[PDB]
Scaffold this active site. Structure first.
Site, PDB file in Angstrom:
ATOM      1  N   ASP A   1      11.258  -7.134   2.609  1.00  0.00           N
ATOM      2  CA  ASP A   1       9.938  -7.305   3.217  1.00  0.00           C
ATOM      3  C   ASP A   1      10.066  -7.787   4.655  1.00  0.00           C
ATOM      4  O   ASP A   1       9.834  -8.959   4.953  1.00  0.00           O
ATOM      5  CB  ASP A   1       9.106  -8.309   2.420  1.00  0.00           C
ATOM      6  CG  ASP A   1       8.838  -7.847   1.006  1.00  0.00           C
ATOM      7  OD1 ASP A   1       9.133  -6.676   0.689  1.00  0.00           O
ATOM      8  OD2 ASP A   1       8.325  -8.651   0.207  1.00  0.00           O
TER       9      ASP A   1
ATOM     10  N   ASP B   1       8.490   0.349  -4.585  1.00  0.00           N
ATOM     11  CA  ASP B   1       7.373  -0.442  -5.078  1.00  0.00           C
ATOM     12  C   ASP B   1       6.082  -0.267  -4.275  1.00  0.00           C
ATOM     13  O   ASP B   1       5.806  -1.022  -3.342  1.00  0.00           O
ATOM     14  CB  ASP B   1       7.783  -1.920  -5.126  1.00  0.00           C
ATOM     15  CG  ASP B   1       6.614  -2.847  -5.351  1.00  0.00           C
ATOM     16  OD1 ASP B   1       5.699  -2.476  -6.110  1.00  0.00           O
ATOM     17  OD2 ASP B   1       6.614  -3.958  -4.779  1.00  0.00           O
ATOM     18  N   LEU B   2       5.299   0.740  -4.659  1.00  0.00           N
ATOM     19  CA  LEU B   2       4.024   1.031  -4.018  1.00  0.00           C
ATOM     20  C   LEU B   2       2.900   0.877  -5.019  1.00  0.00           C
ATOM     21  O   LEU B   2       1.754   1.168  -4.727  1.00  0.00           O
ATOM     22  CB  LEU B   2       4.025   2.444  -3.437  1.00  0.00           C
ATOM     23  CG  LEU B   2       5.100   2.612  -2.365  1.00  0.00           C
ATOM     24  CD1 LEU B   2       5.051   4.018  -1.792  1.00  0.00           C
ATOM     25  CD2 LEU B   2       4.883   1.561  -1.281  1.00  0.00           C
TER      26      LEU B   2
ATOM     27  N   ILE C   1      -6.488   7.638  -9.307  1.00  0.00           N
ATOM     28  CA  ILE C   1      -6.948   8.557 -10.324  1.00  0.00           C
ATOM     29  C   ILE C   1      -5.732   9.313 -10.851  1.00  0.00           C
ATOM     30  O   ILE C   1      -4.764   9.554 -10.121  1.00  0.00           O
ATOM     31  CB  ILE C   1      -7.959   9.564  -9.762  1.00  0.00           C
ATOM     32  CG1 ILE C   1      -7.312  10.397  -8.658  1.00  0.00           C
ATOM     33  CG2 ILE C   1      -9.170   8.829  -9.239  1.00  0.00           C
ATOM     34  CD1 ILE C   1      -8.111  11.616  -8.268  1.00  0.00           C
ATOM     35  N   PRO C   2      -5.759   9.685 -12.132  1.00  0.00           N
ATOM     36  CA  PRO C   2      -4.649  10.414 -12.740  1.00  0.00           C
ATOM     37  C   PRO C   2      -3.986  11.478 -11.861  1.00  0.00           C
ATOM     38  O   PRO C   2      -2.764  11.522 -11.767  1.00  0.00           O
ATOM     39  CB  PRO C   2      -5.284  10.977 -13.997  1.00  0.00           C
ATOM     40  CG  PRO C   2      -6.140   9.809 -14.435  1.00  0.00           C
ATOM     41  CD  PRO C   2      -6.797   9.375 -13.133  1.00  0.00           C
ATOM     42  N   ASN C   3      -4.775  12.326 -11.210  1.00  0.00           N
ATOM     43  CA  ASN C   3      -4.206  13.373 -10.365  1.00  0.00           C
ATOM     44  C   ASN C   3      -3.363  12.823  -9.219  1.00  0.00           C
ATOM     45  O   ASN C   3      -2.299  13.361  -8.908  1.00  0.00           O
ATOM     46  CB  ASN C   3      -5.306  14.254  -9.777  1.00  0.00           C
ATOM     47  CG  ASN C   3      -4.757  15.521  -9.144  1.00  0.00           C
ATOM     48  OD1 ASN C   3      -5.098  15.873  -8.013  1.00  0.00           O
ATOM     49  ND2 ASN C   3      -3.900  16.217  -9.879  1.00  0.00           N
ATOM     50  N   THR C   4      -3.837  11.755  -8.587  1.00  0.00           N
ATOM     51  CA  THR C   4      -3.115  11.166  -7.464  1.00  0.00           C
ATOM     52  C   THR C   4      -1.872  10.415  -7.910  1.00  0.00           C
ATOM     53  O   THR C   4      -0.835  10.471  -7.252  1.00  0.00           O
ATOM     54  CB  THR C   4      -4.017  10.214  -6.668  1.00  0.00           C
ATOM     55  OG1 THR C   4      -5.062  10.970  -6.042  1.00  0.00           O
ATOM     56  CG2 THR C   4      -3.211   9.483  -5.600  1.00  0.00           C
TER      57      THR C   4
ATOM     58  N   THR D   1       2.456 -11.820 -10.419  1.00  0.00           N
ATOM     59  CA  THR D   1       2.955 -13.193 -10.519  1.00  0.00           C
ATOM     60  C   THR D   1       2.233 -14.213  -9.643  1.00  0.00           C
ATOM     61  O   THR D   1       2.372 -15.419  -9.850  1.00  0.00           O
ATOM     62  CB  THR D   1       4.457 -13.254 -10.198  1.00  0.00           C
ATOM     63  OG1 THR D   1       4.714 -12.547  -8.981  1.00  0.00           O
ATOM     64  CG2 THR D   1       5.258 -12.624 -11.317  1.00  0.00           C
TER      65      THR D   1
ATOM     66  N   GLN E   1       3.203 -17.340  -4.660  1.00  0.00           N
ATOM     67  CA  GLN E   1       3.743 -17.068  -5.986  1.00  0.00           C
ATOM     68  C   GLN E   1       3.209 -18.163  -6.924  1.00  0.00           C
ATOM     69  O   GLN E   1       3.098 -19.322  -6.525  1.00  0.00           O
ATOM     70  CB  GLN E   1       5.269 -17.100  -5.882  1.00  0.00           C
ATOM     71  CG  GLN E   1       6.026 -16.111  -6.747  1.00  0.00           C
ATOM     72  CD  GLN E   1       5.621 -14.667  -6.526  1.00  0.00           C
ATOM     73  OE1 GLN E   1       4.643 -14.198  -7.097  1.00  0.00           O
ATOM     74  NE2 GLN E   1       6.373 -13.955  -5.691  1.00  0.00           N
TER      75      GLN E   1
ATOM     76  N   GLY F   1      12.710 -12.104  -3.004  1.00  0.00           N
ATOM     77  CA  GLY F   1      12.466 -11.777  -1.617  1.00  0.00           C
ATOM     78  C   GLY F   1      12.807 -12.906  -0.673  1.00  0.00           C
ATOM     79  O   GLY F   1      13.970 -13.116  -0.338  1.00  0.00           O
TER      80      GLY F   1
END
Ligand SMILES: O=C1CC(=O)N([C@@H]2O[C@H](COP(=O)(O)O)[C@@H](O)[C@H]2O)C(=O)N1
Ligand SMILES: O=C1CC(=O)N([C@@H]2O[C@H](COP(=O)(O)O)[C@@H](O)[C@H]2O)C(=O)N1
Lengths: 231, 231
Positions: free
Chosen positions: B11, B60-61, B66-69, B120, B190, B210
């Site tokens: 990060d 990690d995004l 929506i399902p299609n995306t 978390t 955290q 991190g």
């Protein structure tokens, strides 16, 4: 700037397949939306290419992470100079506040900061798996309320919540609404749909349209026709 | 490959600062996580440079759309050839199902697919605003159950849930847990934290670290210290 409330979702798996469409339209015809698919594929450089041609870009990454990450990501989007950037309201107050606060340093250049409420592809049955007792509309209003309280500029939701939302939050709270299907169009995974015309009457600020346009041969013509209807 | 359960969260708001760290380490020492911050800043090319060095990359995004995306984004991640890709469990069963199915055409090459349960950085209070009455633990367990039913490879959660999850979902179900803070280090935003040693003892499969590492006075030795501790 542009006059159409239409934001076309550029959801292609090829760069040139997108720009073939983009080169046939003009910044006055609409704004563009770069989402998770095309951004995971081509990154910030694709967004600069579109900003080069002169289009306003809505970076749609629905940042839904811990406050720290959310802030840095929104700050990164601001560095990109995008017109509008996303965030998930279900990320909570602290996350949304940190996101808003991360844009102060960018002053005037800051992009509009919008929060996704309830995805237009979700109905009660979908929300019920998370143990979410409230209906889509009710939960969405709770999310938008938190969004407004944290100082965000608006929300992403279904046009089915536009009249209610506009009343509860005011005309200033921007509503960005996907789940737009002109009549006849295939719903797909979309659930809380409305036609371009219905969405405008509901008083939405921006409507997001993807497949109805991009799935057609000559999508520019379809984008043109839709705009025609909004008059 | 590495036998360390440590996945370092890259990060940084500066590409070279991140590479200066990565170069001081080796793929046999740990895995790397590229999140929304660095990814929004440098896109897929950054991931490739890390990959060209031999590291397993955890993208990690937290796709939550929506399902299609979700499907096309996950497919895009597989195209990137990453070791592990992310998704938000609260995105629903249909969305997670679409994600799993979008990886079938990648066969053996398919990356590990994991769903984020409850972040978390959240506690009961944070969920209350959302209208969620279940505790971070129970809501997470619910999200983990749905994730397994949908056929995903595992979940992202707190080490505070590892013990419980492990005995309720089995050893196979993979647990990735951030919120790792070695005594003395700053908690930050955290909330449901645990020390590396505690996390290991708790049964997590992988732990994400991190700031304790990247922001330490000597990150390389800190990684070394931790790795040695986990033995
Ligand atoms: O609630 C939402 C938000 C959203 O961004 N979107 C996006 O709107 C785009 C276009 O969808 P469609 O092709 O018109 O069905 C895609 O980028 C979606 O991820 C959505 O469909 N529902
Ligand atoms: O529940 C979660 C998921 C997650 O990915 N993360 C990520 O783990 C990383 C490291 O956080 P930290 O610096 O150790 O506090 C960041 O990239 C976070 O977005 C987290 O802290 N909690």
């Amino acid at each position: 700037v542009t006059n159409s409330p239409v934001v076309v979702a550029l959801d292609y798996h090829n760069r040139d397949d997108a720009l073939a469409f983009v080169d046939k339209i003009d910044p006055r015809d609409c704004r563009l939306k770069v989402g998770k698919e095309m951004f995971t594929l081509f990154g910030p450089q694709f967004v600069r290419e579109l900003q080069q041609r002169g289009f306003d870009i809505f970076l749609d990454l629905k940042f839904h992470d811990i406050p720290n990450t959310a802030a840095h990501a929104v700050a990164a989007a601001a560095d990109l100079g995008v017109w509008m950037v996303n965030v998930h309201a279900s990320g909570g107050a602290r996350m949304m506040t940190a996101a808003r606060e991360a844009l102060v340093p960018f002053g005037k250049d800051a992009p509009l900061l919008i929060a996704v409420t309830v995805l237009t592809s979700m109905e009660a049955s979908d929300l019920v798996d998370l143990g979410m007792t409230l209906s889509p509309a009710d939960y969405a209003e709770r999310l938008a309320a938190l969004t407004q309280k944290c100082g965000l500029d608006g929300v992403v939701c279904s046009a089915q919540e536009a009249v209610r939302f506009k009343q509860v939050f005011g005309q200033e709270f921007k509503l960005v609404t996907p789940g737009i299907r002109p009549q006849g169009s295939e719903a797909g995974d979309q659930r809380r749909i409305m036609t371009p015309e219905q969405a405008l009457s509901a008083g939405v600020d921006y409507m997001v349209i993807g497949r109805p346009v991009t799935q057609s041969v000559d999508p520019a013509q379809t984008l043109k026709a839709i705009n025609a209807s909004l008059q």
